[PDB]
Design an enzyme around this catalytic site. Structure first.
Site, PDB file in Angstrom:
ATOM      1  N   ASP A 167       0.841  -1.201   0.000  1.00  0.00           N
ATOM      2  CA  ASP A 167       0.000   0.000   0.000  1.00  0.00           C
ATOM      3  C   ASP A 167       0.875   1.249   0.000  1.00  0.00           C
ATOM      4  O   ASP A 167       1.973   1.244  -0.544  1.00  0.00           O
ATOM      5  CB  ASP A 167      -0.955  -0.063   1.193  1.00  0.00           C
ATOM      6  CG  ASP A 167      -2.288   0.587   0.929  1.00  0.00           C
ATOM      7  OD1 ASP A 167      -2.308   1.817   0.835  1.00  0.00           O
ATOM      8  OD2 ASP A 167      -3.347  -0.105   0.848  1.00  0.00           O
ATOM      9  N   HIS A 190      -3.628   6.172   3.417  1.00  0.00           N
ATOM     10  CA  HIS A 190      -4.413   5.048   2.922  1.00  0.00           C
ATOM     11  C   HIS A 190      -3.969   3.723   3.520  1.00  0.00           C
ATOM     12  O   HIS A 190      -4.768   2.945   4.079  1.00  0.00           O
ATOM     13  CB  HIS A 190      -4.308   5.033   1.407  1.00  0.00           C
ATOM     14  CG  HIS A 190      -5.247   4.085   0.754  1.00  0.00           C
ATOM     15  ND1 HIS A 190      -4.905   2.788   0.454  1.00  0.00           N
ATOM     16  CD2 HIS A 190      -6.526   4.243   0.348  1.00  0.00           C
ATOM     17  CE1 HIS A 190      -5.946   2.177  -0.076  1.00  0.00           C
ATOM     18  NE2 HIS A 190      -6.946   3.031  -0.140  1.00  0.00           N
ATOM     19  N   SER A 244     -11.031  -0.426  -1.427  1.00  0.00           N
ATOM     20  CA  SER A 244      -9.796  -0.628  -0.677  1.00  0.00           C
ATOM     21  C   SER A 244     -10.099  -1.103   0.758  1.00  0.00           C
ATOM     22  O   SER A 244      -9.425  -2.009   1.283  1.00  0.00           O
ATOM     23  CB  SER A 244      -9.026   0.686  -0.658  1.00  0.00           C
ATOM     24  OG  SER A 244      -9.874   1.712  -0.175  1.00  0.00           O
TER      25      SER A 244
END
Ligand code: CL
Length: 369
Positions: A70, A101, A311
């Site tokens: 990520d 994120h 996600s």
């Protein structure tokens, strides 16, 4: 357009870290924040949808290692369980998140309970953070910056990162970032395919990927099942390829549902989608220095918007996979994927190109015989 197949003459790549060319930061780093008017400390309806309370009576993910491929993961009090896995952007250890994120994803997987209603799915699991991408960075040399070039660059690091994760002992490998390419311009992905096959079979890792969100190239939903003989899921009709989701059978591709279990409006349809999990109004851990709870990011003109996307759905599924592998440590990755999909909420219907076998059902997965 047909399901991808590995070329047996092509070897997996090495798991070497580092970018292919020097990168420079082009945008200021971002942290996730609290959306005004919300109470992130309340137990999220997304947790209640998954019955994580029930699941924790069977497993908390002990002994399992989940790789988070990520934007990096920022350690803090709610993420003391993160191991360095390196960097494909700069030369960090993977424990710097300039985007927010990776941290949000890591938090959903194995964030710690605390003085509020938030917990990761698998808080006794360990995480390895590999920073594989960041939109805050670009090549230092300002050359061709096209969808095609960016996508190829992204696949090249993704394949290495997958091998690195597997070789570091990851039992579950989470890929919440998505790259899409138009079907008429999808180039050979033999190296990525080789990497995913290596990790899924020889290294026996469960690989979980976000399916993508509608609107490289902008991702777009593909036409739904159309009754074509021999092509019930409508691979033939694909116009937008979601990477690495299309690499069936090695990757469990995860769509997003609302808290009631219905397909999220933004979830990208494709013939590869295998399962779903909550993807709306997400609350998780922040990459801000305090490392507390957050539930928003800046959008246009710096207005905060909720955390939404496939996600986060993928992250939930990775956490559930860690629960399942801890409880049933002798199962292969194929057996674990079968258990997850056969016990999902819509498993008795033909698979949906939006949500696959439907919303993951952790307690059912943990108790099925
Ligand atoms: Cl619950």
């Amino acid at each position: 357009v047909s399901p991808p197949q590995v070329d047996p003459q092509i070897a997996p790549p090495p798991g070497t870290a580092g970018p292919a060319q020097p990168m420079m930061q082009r945008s200021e780093c971002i942290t996730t924040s609290v959306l005004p008017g919300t109470d992130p400390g309340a137990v999220s309806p997304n947790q209640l949808a998954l019955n994580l309370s029930g699941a924790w009576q069977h497993s908390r993910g002990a002994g399992q290692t989940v790789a988070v491929i990520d934007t990096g993961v920022q350690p803090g009090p709610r993420l003391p369980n993160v191991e360095a896995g390196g960097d494909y952007i700069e030369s960090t250890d993977g424990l710097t998140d300039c985007d927010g994120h990776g941290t949000s994803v890591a938090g959903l997987i194995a964030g710690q309970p605390g003085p509020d209603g938030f917990s990761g799915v698998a808080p006794e699991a360990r995480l390895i953070s590999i920073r594989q991408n960041s939109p805050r960075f670009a090549p230092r040399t300002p050359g061709a910056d096209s969808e095609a070039t960016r996508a190829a660059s992204d696949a090249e690091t993704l394949a290495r990162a997958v091998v690195r994760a597997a070789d570091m002992g990851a039992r579950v490998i989470n890929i919440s970032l998505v790259t899409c390419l138009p079907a008429d311009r999808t180039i050979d992905q033999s190296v990525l395919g080789a990497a995913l096959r290596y990790a899924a079979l020889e290294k026996d890792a469960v690989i979980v990927a976000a399916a993508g969100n509608n609107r490289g190239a902008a991702c777009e939903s593909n036409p739904l099942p159309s009754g074509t003989p021999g092509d019930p899921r409508n691979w033939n009709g694909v116009t937008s390829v979601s990477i690495p989701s299309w690499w069936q059978p090695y990757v469990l591709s995860v769509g997003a549902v609302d808290s009631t279990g219905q397909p999220s409006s933004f979830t990208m349809a494709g013939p590869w989608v295998g399962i779903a999990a909550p993807g709306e109004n997400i609350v998780s851990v922040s990459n801000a220095p305090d490392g507390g709870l957050s539930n928003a990011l800046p959008s246009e003109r710096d207005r905060l918007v909720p955390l939404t996307g496939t996600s986060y759905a993928a992250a939930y599924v990775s956490g559930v996979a860690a629960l399942v592998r801890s409880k049933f440590p002798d199962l292969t990755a194929r057996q674990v994927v079968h258990r997850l999909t056969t016990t999902a909420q819509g498993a008795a219907r033909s698979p949906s190109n939006l949500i696959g076998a439907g919303m993951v059902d952790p307690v059912a997965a943990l108790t099925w015989d």
